[PDB]
């Protein structure tokens, strides 16, 4: 009996009354439209935006911390080399804006040097993320933005084959170029190659080298695309699992262990992967919200008053929209709770408070690599956690409106069976 039931749960009485009133239903639909714009159209104030930004910053920060300590070297087929120095520019090396891969004789692979092939995948992804962070991520609903990325690397030493036409695609080591494209959007890559002799005016360094430039045009900068690069970054590090060896300054923060393999940061890498996975799921809710627009007013038909049992076929759509928005908000929250140091403990807390959520540069803009980036995050992780919380706090009214609307729709989906 329903009177018995509503005397105990008078909010349900109110809900049923709202569900039978086109004017309250339309008010709830309007709210969903305004909460959707807050989530997928805004930047500062969107918890979904702040969480996507946090997932990417954490991946990028992870490398800024440990990249300088990571061994890499060898030749082009993942094989050991005799005297190959391959240097990747705009990377957070030890007191340097390059990382130098010059470990010879050891076979690349697990608990050994990262292969140059793996460093190339990692570096390309790092360059795209840093360029994008520097320009600013767009709001989630923006899928056709692009960025231009340029990066360089050099090969020197007898027998170094990582800069060779055969590997690079190019025709001639000195002067050649190559254009190639790939994919739902076309990205065009322009590779060009140059040789600098040891005995050539302007060559500070002792030695002959080849310089490779890659210019990528039309790289997409949407959340999905960038989350895919972050995942490529973190998964290449974890799968390749190279040897690292750290330098601890006396005084500041101490890294244990001091030597080992990068996979060995199992808590850290798991967390980042989870953040990225949750942020992918979160961004996917955007197509659900887009598919089920709520801007069309609803009401009775051919003269009659609204009938909640027959006129409510829009409810399924309203329920899916509302639930997707709630899911975005919950996943955003979850992303923050994965990395927030207030709830971490031991090794992992120390890694975040001491290293990841720290910058040693002289707020320099996002995406900047200096000679002091190394052993620190420099990806705005503290600021981004704070802003995620600020935006959740500023989403109080909208969250209650999303719940009201989910409940109204759910009441109509039940009445409609």
């Amino acid at each position: 009996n329903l009177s018995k039931l509503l005397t105990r749960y008078s909010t349900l009485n109110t809900l049923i009354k709202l569900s039978a009133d086109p004017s309250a239903i339309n008010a709830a639909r309007e709210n969903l439209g305004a909460s959707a714009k807050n989530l997928i159209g805004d930047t500062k104030n969107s918890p979904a935006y702040q969480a996507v930004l946090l997932a990417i910053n954490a991946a990028v920060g992870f490398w800024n911390v440990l990249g300088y300590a990571t061994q890499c070297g060898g030749n082009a087929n993942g094989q050991e080399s005799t005297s190959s120095t391959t240097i990747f520019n705009n990377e957070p090396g030890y007191r340097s804006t390059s990382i130098t891969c010059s470990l010879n004789r050891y076979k690349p692979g697990y608990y050994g040097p990262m292969s140059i092939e793996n460093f190339k995948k990692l570096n390309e992804a790092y360059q795209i993320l840093q360029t994008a962070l520097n320009k600013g991520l767009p709001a989630l609903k923006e899928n056709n933005g692009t960025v231009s990325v340029t990066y360089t690397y050099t090969c020197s030493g007898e027998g170094n084959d990582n800069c060779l036409p055969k590997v690079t695609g190019v025709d001639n080591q000195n002067g050649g170029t190559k254009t190639k494209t790939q994919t739902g959007k076309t990205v065009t890559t322009t590779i060009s190659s140059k040789v600098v002799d040891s005995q050539a005016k302007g060559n500070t360094t002792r030695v002959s080298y080849t310089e490779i430039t890659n210019k990528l045009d039309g790289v997409p900068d949407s959340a999905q695309a960038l989350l895919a690069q972050a995942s490529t970054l973190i998964n290449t590090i974890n799968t390749a699992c190279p040897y690292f060896s750290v330098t601890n300054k006396s005084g500041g923060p101490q890294m244990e262990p001091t030597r080992g393999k990068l996979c060995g940061f199992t808590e850290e890498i798991s967390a980042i992967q989870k953040m990225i996975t949750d942020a992918q799921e979160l961004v996917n809710q955007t197509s659900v919200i887009n598919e089920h627009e709520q801007s069309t007013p609803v009401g009775g038909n051919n003269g009659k008053p609204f009938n909640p049992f027959t006129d409510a076929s829009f409810a399924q759509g309203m329920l899916a929209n509302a639930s997707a928005q709630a899911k975005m908000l919950n996943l955003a929250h979850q992303v923050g709770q994965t990395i927030n140091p207030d709830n971490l403990t031991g090794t992992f807390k120390n890694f975040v408070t001491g290293f990841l959520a720290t910058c040693n540069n002289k707020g320099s803009p996002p995406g900047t690599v200096t000679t002091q980036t190394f052993a620190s995050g420099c990806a705005y992780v503290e600021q981004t956690i704070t802003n995620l919380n600020n935006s959740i706090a500023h989403f109080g009214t909208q969250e209650q409106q999303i719940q009201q609307a989910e409940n109204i729709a759910d009441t109509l989906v039940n009445f409609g069976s």
Partner: nanobody, 113 residues
Framework: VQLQESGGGLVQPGGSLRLSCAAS????????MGWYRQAPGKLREWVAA???????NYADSVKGRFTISRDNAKNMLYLQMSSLKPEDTALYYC????????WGQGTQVTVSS
């Protein structure tokens, strides 16, 4: 995973009340927390919120008159209500934002001459 409000009662208009919430650590720690209320014939309404670092924000209906605060050492959340009007009459509830799906029992506030 638990929430427990207290401090409500019947007061006169112009009056003042301090509400408390005892939350569990898993709810409270590192989370934005806030207060809500549910007035007669209406659905639950968001009232105030506060970040882990202590920055508060308020709904227009209470801004200037209520103050939200948190004690991070005891997982307590507080709401100081001043200049009460009959329209502040409601069951008040606390939660984290976004909300844990099981609410506490609430505390009744009635303002009336």
């Amino acid at each position: 995973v638990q929430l427990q409000e207290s401090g409500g009662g019947l007061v006169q208009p112009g009056g003042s009340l301090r509400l408390s919430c005892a939350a569990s650590g898993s709810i409270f720690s590192g989370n934005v927390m806030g207060w809500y209320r549910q007035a007669p014939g209406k659905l639950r309404e968001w009232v105030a919120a506060i970040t882990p670092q202590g920055v508060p924000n308020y709904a227009d209906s209470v801004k200037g008159r209520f103050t939200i605060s948190r004690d991070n050492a005891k997982n307590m959340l507080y709401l100081q209500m001043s200049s009460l009007k009959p329209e502040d009459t409601a069951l008040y509830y606390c939660n984290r934002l976004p909300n844990y799906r099981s609410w506490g029992q609430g505390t009744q506030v009635t303002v009336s001459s």
